[PDB]
Amino acid sequence: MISKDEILEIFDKYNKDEITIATLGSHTSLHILKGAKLEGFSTVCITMKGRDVPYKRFKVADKFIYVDNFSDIKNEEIQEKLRELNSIVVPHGSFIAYCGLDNVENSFLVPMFGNRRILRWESERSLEGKLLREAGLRVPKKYESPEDIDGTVIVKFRGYFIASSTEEFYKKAEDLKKRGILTDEDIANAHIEEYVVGTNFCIHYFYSPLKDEVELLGMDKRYESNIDGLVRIPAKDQLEMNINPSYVITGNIPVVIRESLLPQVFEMGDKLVAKAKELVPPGMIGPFCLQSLCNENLELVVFEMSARVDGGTNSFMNGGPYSFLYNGEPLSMGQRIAREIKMALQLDMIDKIIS
Amino acid sequence: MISKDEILEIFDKYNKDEITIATLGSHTSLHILKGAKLEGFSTVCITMKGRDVPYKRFKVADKFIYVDNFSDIKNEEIQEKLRELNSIVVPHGSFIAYCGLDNVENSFLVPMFGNRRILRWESERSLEGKLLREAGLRVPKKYESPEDIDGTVIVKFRGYFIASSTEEFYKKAEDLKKRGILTDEDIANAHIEEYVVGTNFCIHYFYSPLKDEVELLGMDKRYESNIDGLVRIPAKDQLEMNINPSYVITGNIPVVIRESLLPQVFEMGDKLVAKAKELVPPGMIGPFCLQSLCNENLELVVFEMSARVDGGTNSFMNGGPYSFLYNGEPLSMGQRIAREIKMALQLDMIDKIIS
Amino acid sequence: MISKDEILEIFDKYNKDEITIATLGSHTSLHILKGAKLEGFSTVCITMKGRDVPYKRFKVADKFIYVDNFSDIKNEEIQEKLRELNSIVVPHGSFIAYCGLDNVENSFLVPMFGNRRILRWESERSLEGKLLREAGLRVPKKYESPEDIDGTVIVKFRGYFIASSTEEFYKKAEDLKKRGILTDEDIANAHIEEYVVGTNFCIHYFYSPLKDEVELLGMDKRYESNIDGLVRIPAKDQLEMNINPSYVITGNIPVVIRESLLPQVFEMGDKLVAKAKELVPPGMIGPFCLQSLCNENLELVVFEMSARVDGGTNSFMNGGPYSFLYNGEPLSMGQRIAREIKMALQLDMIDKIIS
Amino acid sequence: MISKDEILEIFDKYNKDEITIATLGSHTSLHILKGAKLEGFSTVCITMKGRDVPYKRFKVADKFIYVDNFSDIKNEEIQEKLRELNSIVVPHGSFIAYCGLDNVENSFLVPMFGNRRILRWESERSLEGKLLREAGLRVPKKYESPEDIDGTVIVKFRGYFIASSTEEFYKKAEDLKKRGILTDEDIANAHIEEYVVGTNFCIHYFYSPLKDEVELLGMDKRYESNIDGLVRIPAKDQLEMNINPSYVITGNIPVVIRESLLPQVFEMGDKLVAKAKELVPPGMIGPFCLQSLCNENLELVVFEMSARVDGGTNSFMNGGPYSFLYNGEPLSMGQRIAREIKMALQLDMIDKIIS
Numbered sequence A, B, C, D: 001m002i003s004k005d006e007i008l009e010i011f012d013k014y015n016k017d018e019i020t021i022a023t024l025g026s027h028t029s030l031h032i033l034k035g036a037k038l039e040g041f042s043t044v045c046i047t048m049k050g051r052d053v054p055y056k057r058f059k060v061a062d063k064f065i066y067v068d069n070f071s072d073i074k075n076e077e078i079q080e081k082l083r084e085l086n087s088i089v090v091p092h093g094s095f096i097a098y099c100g101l102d103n104v105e106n107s108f109l110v111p112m113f114g115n116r117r118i119l120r121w122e123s124e125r126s127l128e129g130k131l132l133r134e135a136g137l138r139v140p141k142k143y144e145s146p147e148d149i150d151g152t153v154i155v156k157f158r159g160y161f162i163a164s165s166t167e168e169f170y171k172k173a174e175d176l177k178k179r180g181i182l183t184d185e186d187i188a189n190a191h192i193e194e195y196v197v198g199t200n201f202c203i204h205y206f207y208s209p210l211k212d213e214v215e216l217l218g219m220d221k222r223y224e225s226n227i228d229g230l231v232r233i234p235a236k237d238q239l240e241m242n243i244n245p246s247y248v249i250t251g252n253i254p255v256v257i258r259e260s261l262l263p264q265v266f267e268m269g270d271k272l273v274a275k276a277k278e279l280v281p282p283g284m285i286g287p288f289c290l291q292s293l294c295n296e297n298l299e300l301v302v303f304e305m306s307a308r309v310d311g312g313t314n315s316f317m318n319g320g321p322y323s324f325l326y327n328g329e330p331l332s333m334g335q336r337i338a339r340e341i342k343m344a345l346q347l348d349m350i351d352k353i354i355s
């Protein structure tokens, strides 16, 4: 529901000489806040007892707004403090989750960096696939039912598993059922797709509405448990174990891509952006990520995406190989966001970046 | 035996205007020496013919003290040169090994950064486990004998192996016995623990006695041979080979952790420090490392630790994502050590950091 | 054929106040061009429609020379523009390929950084092995025929495979034959060598002819598809699949080596350089790479090498742990090349670095 | 005559990926060119034999366009090279002089940073006084004739002199007449104004059309010959000499103003800008200077001004106290100009800054 006018008229009552940058203390906040400080902003960090130490010891937040539980950040009391501090909120994974995507779309009355409407297209598998398909991006083949399996597939609902036949699908579904890991409701709505065999590149882009340009900021590969621990056990020992893979994100490793593939990398970003303009105006604003796998034919297949900042940007908080190229600076995604905010304020174009 | 008074009174006869930083040319010396230079110190590097090139070409040492063999660094001749150069020695893995931990505790009369007594708690498995257990840190389950195996275990004595049953334990012990890799004495004192299946995070902390604060400096994951080569062979081919895994440290890869896990990361550091104060006064001084595995339940299990600088700090000699956050600088662990030395000298608190 | 005199006399007609650095827009050009800009050069990038975006958005090239297809860069029309721009060309993988190594040796009349003759010793397996063998570097054992297989081997011709017996060799050769991946001509000239089981370190060196010194600039490990995707599938699932490994380079991951191994690392560089002086005068000039595997005995075995810049230097475009050590700068290989060019021009020694 | 459309349509045919910055090698070019390089531009310097050394040894120009004499820079041959190089010209004192202000207004068909029309308001004393008077800025009292002198005055036409009475005016005019320094035509059109007794502050501002903001970049005091040499002779010796003062600009000395006076400094800049918008649309663009004297009542009296970059910006080529404040950078006026050009190109607003 929340209008752009409701937001612009909230920001119009802001002290334009004291604009701060706020975010919830988690996910990617460390470089969101650091980047803001480095661009000259004073920063606000929503935190809580037990989870504030990293933000205190890294000295990255000027003002703390403590909540009883991160769920409270939707409360009207918290929205007010943020408005009185002249904060533009930078949204991220943990924030959307703890606040509630519905509360974010029509209950959170605080200016927010990015395209508020498009956060819904990252939450729903159908919208995401619609976007990527319509943008013209390679994705994994989808399988309507366990009976359609004709190759290796991954099945999504942590509770993940791999299958190479219909028979195997049920053997594993059942296994996870009796072990209490999975329930009938989950396996009823199982999502089955082609297992893509390749190298992981989570590609972090930035669309600048001020420059009308898609920029490449960096890349990481996921570090997931238990899978990355499992496959580090020799085959002979794996066969002697009764262990199922899980794919819980635990961290990130820096990576760069083969340079001849950057035209493809950029084209993918350009296409996603051009289509999202049509489907969800004004489209992508700021940080977005394509989570892909590079197959042996040097084709990037995207199995996921984000419409705001992805957690993997943490791998280059001190800048990376790509982010260096622009100005030879240790540029993080967090600082790139802050800069767009800085420039927008200076050019009187806050309306191109907030909603 | 070596007293703190024996050391303070050695340092009291130092030219306080010409304090240098010394270390043995190996392990982590490159950034120990670089960091020192960057903080304004002149540096001394103990080296030898055949092993001096890296320190010469990286231009990181101002004075070289050549020895016939690194074993000589315990010699009274070498301790004298170091004392005449006004050197505070920064200890590390290779230094403690080549010098001799016993020689270090009561025969090495040179001021040393860190808590000299606590180096013994990192050498002995019982002390280490006592510390970690008492600090309240998750560790792998220990197994008293091969007959207690009820899951997958790793067995330690390079000569390592994995077992999933009592039967397998002896099959493998025997295999390694007849191949000459392992002897009856080693397998008699075998250490058997739960094989933890997860992602490796070697977490490098710094406790500042001046600030009374535990800082997070960075993280690496180990790159070990042959294991990391072995598991890169496809399963079908592994099964056709007669090859045992080994876990010889060969290098390090940078990694960052999921941000929501930093409160846990920091809490672990805080607890280790608080307990080590009680058990080995004054406790941890400067660099320490928790070598952990993150399981699918997002719990960090520490299978090892160091009470001085860990080799994995080499992964961020040009700074890392975490070390950047403090001041936006390319800060290495070596430079963080040097700075504490700098600040201690300036505040007349050399007694808080040397022994 | 192309003489050093033919080249020096081409450069002698250059405007020495307007020397630019040129390269083809691919492979490693991003930091070749960035490094040049950072050293004060104006830069020329050969590019084409569809592949120019990365070089435009990273703002790394001052002048673009567009070609219809990268194959045209051999054309006399293109050599002229480069000569009129006073360009010294920095050669790399994609450039030598698209231009043609034969065209490079005697048809490309443009000054070029490096030793032009030695590019042939990197293209031919016999010359390379001669060099490495004569330099005294550990290499994988070679196998004359499938009948000599007495261990695990890798077989080279993407079309690669692993074998542990003569029987397996033919089973797999045949498999790849009927699947259309491999033809009789390829398997007739198959190269069979010892499969080395260890950790990958692609070591990037720089030989400075001005300083007569081999420098260590950085290291990466390869990120290859599908192999690195394949071995991330649990063993039980791999066995259920009919999938062959491929080793297509897709990207790079940063790594550092155990510090005690740097004397070996440096010695290897020193030896390769000393022998290449004898075998191909003046020897190595500028960037060269040893692609190695570290076995459990801590011995580096080199399975490949380059005589110019290797693609893995892309992992440290913002500098790395080793490159930092010299001057505490974010130094890339591209900038190190540019600097040697800068210094050579300033000292009137362009003849030590071009040909 | 030259239209904005004539210029925009010249720039519209420019290769927008290869925009360079050009200027004549004199006046303030060193930091104009340096600043451009620092912002990523390739630079063009118009120079000539005998006057090119500073630009060559400071390594500040990528391309040289040599002319026979600086007067040639109006020639259509030179305008073409500049257009083929995609140069935006940055105008300055020596350029306007050597080219010819009339040639600049309607014969110089090359895009130019700044407001082309307003260069005429800096050349004509009546326009300048109109502007400053209408802006509401304190100026020295004007005197219509030698008979109106009722205080100390300075008389302008190098050929300058000071008078405290009508009688003295003629005594000195005559003196300079018989010495050949001055001719009847000059003294016929003599400009007589109040001698202001105070401290010199040449204040360098920058109006950003993109930000709609007047910025303070720095300040210098003039170093003039022979006057600054004359007044360094003790009074007793001056009285024994037959020497007239001259005020030939020879150099600049850095100075900062009393901080409580910055509101006045800024207000003066704001007023000049607001009025110049009305009188010469779009008004001031980029660099402008108020040359003032601070009297004992702490009032700044402006005796001169420039509508483009003033020579005194040379005093802070490595940045100054004021220019540092924005981002803690060594920011020169030349780099501030280049940045506005950079930002304009990126935001597609080249029309706000060129003409």
Ligand SMILES: Nc1ncnc2c1ncn2[C@@H]1O[C@H](COP(=O)(O)OP(=O)(O)OP(=O)(O)O)[C@@H](O)[C@H]1O
Pocket: A140, A154, A156, A193, A194, A195, A196, A197, A222, A224, A247, A248, A249, A291, A293, A303, A304, A305
């Ligand atoms: N089509 C696929 N083929 C092969 N592996 C896949 C595929 N899809 C997902 N995976 C693996 O499962 C992991 C989790 O994928 P998922 O689709 O859950 O991403 P996500 O929802 O963005 O979760 P996260 O936020 O933790 O990245 C991926 O990182 C990848 O390793």
Ligand SMILES: Nc1ncnc2c1ncn2[C@@H]1O[C@H](COP(=O)(O)OP(=O)(O)OP(=O)(O)O)[C@@H](O)[C@H]1O
Pocket: B140, B154, B156, B193, B194, B195, B196, B197, B222, B224, B247, B248, B249, B291, B293, B303, B304, B305
């Ligand atoms: N409990 C465990 N579960 C799973 N893997 C383990 C466990 N303990 C050790 N490993 C593996 O064995 C390797 C060597 O562990 P070890 O306990 O020998 O560490 P260390 O003595 O500190 O040796 P290094 O100094 O080389 O790190 C670890 O890096 C890890 O990969």
Ligand SMILES: Nc1ncnc2c1ncn2[C@@H]1O[C@H](COP(=O)(O)OP(=O)(O)OP(=O)(O)O)[C@@H](O)[C@H]1O
Pocket: C140, C154, C156, C193, C194, C195, C196, C197, C222, C224, C247, C248, C249, C291, C293, C303, C304, C305
């Ligand atoms: N002797 C070997 N033992 C084990 N693995 C090997 C061996 N030789 C090659 N490999 C694996 O195959 C990959 C490709 O090796 P190859 O010899 O084709 O290198 P290359 O020709 O330099 O190709 P690229 O330019 O892509 O690195 C290596 O990166 C390595 O992972």
Ligand SMILES: Nc1ncnc2c1ncn2[C@@H]1O[C@H](COP(=O)(O)OP(=O)(O)OP(=O)(O)O)[C@@H](O)[C@H]1O
Pocket: D140, D154, D156, D193, D194, D195, D196, D197, D222, D224, D247, D248, D249, D291, D293, D303, D304, D305
């Ligand atoms: N009204 C005044 N009162 C006192 N001194 C003055 C006055 N006007 C000028 N001067 C002195 O004469 C010098 C030259 O002033 P002038 O008006 O010629 O400046 P200009 O034309 O901008 O020359 P330049 O470009 O060399 O600064 C000034 O720097 C100042 O020292």
Ligand SMILES: NC(=O)c1ncn([C@@H]2O[C@H](COP(=O)(O)O)[C@@H](O)[C@H]2O)c1N
Pocket: A026, A027, A093, A094, A097, A249, A250, A251, A252, A310, A311, A312, A314, B257, B258, B259, B260, B261
């Ligand atoms: N890549 C990362 O480091 C990362 N960190 C977090 N995330 C995603 O963000 C979500 C919220 O993070 P958290 O559960 O740590 O609060 C997680 O469910 C996960 O999908 C990531 N992908």
Ligand SMILES: NC(=O)c1ncn([C@@H]2O[C@H](COP(=O)(O)O)[C@@H](O)[C@H]2O)c1N
Pocket: B026, B027, B093, B094, B097, B249, B250, B251, B252, B310, B311, B312, B314, C257, C258, C259, C260, C261
């Ligand atoms: N992680 C590392 O790079 C590392 N480098 C050395 N070490 C430890 O330090 C000890 C001494 O090192 P060295 O053997 O290279 O002299 C080794 O036995 C090993 O346990 C490490 N963990």
Ligand SMILES: NC(=O)c1ncn([C@@H]2O[C@H](COP(=O)(O)O)[C@@H](O)[C@H]2O)c1N
Pocket: A257, A258, A259, A260, A261, C026, C027, C093, C094, C097, C249, C250, C251, C252, C310, C311, C312, C314
């Ligand atoms: N390591 C790399 O990133 C890399 N990038 C390219 N290359 C080599 O350079 C050759 C040419 O590269 P390209 O095919 O991207 O033009 C490739 O065949 C490959 O052997 C590499 N090794």
Ligand SMILES: NC(=O)c1ncn([C@@H]2O[C@H](COP(=O)(O)O)[C@@H](O)[C@H]2O)c1N
Pocket: D026, D027, D093, D094, D097, D249, D250, D251, D252, D310, D311, D312, D314
């Ligand atoms: N302040 C200076 O350094 C300065 N340098 C030059 N100028 C002005 O620029 C005019 C042109 O300079 P030049 O004569 O050096 O070519 C000079 O007549 C003088 O009025 C200055 N004010």
Ligand SMILES: [Cl-]
Pocket: A203, A204, A205, A287, A288, A289, A308, A309, A310, A313, A333
């Ligand atoms: Cl992102």
Ligand SMILES: [Cl-]
Pocket: A093, A306, A309, A310, A311, A312
């Ligand atoms: Cl995320």
Ligand SMILES: [Cl-]
Pocket: B203, B204, B205, B287, B288, B289, B308, B309, B310, B313, B333
């Ligand atoms: Cl450590």
Ligand SMILES: [Cl-]
Pocket: B093, B306, B309, B310, B311, B312
């Ligand atoms: Cl260690």
Ligand SMILES: [Cl-]
Pocket: C203, C204, C205, C287, C288, C289, C308, C309, C310, C313, C333
């Ligand atoms: Cl290289």
Ligand SMILES: [Cl-]
Pocket: C093, C306, C309, C310, C311, C312
């Ligand atoms: Cl290569």
Ligand SMILES: [Cl-]
Pocket: D203, D204, D205, D287, D288, D289, D308, D309, D310, D313, D333
């Ligand atoms: Cl100015």
Ligand SMILES: [Cl-]
Pocket: D093, D306, D309, D310, D311, D312
């Ligand atoms: Cl001037």
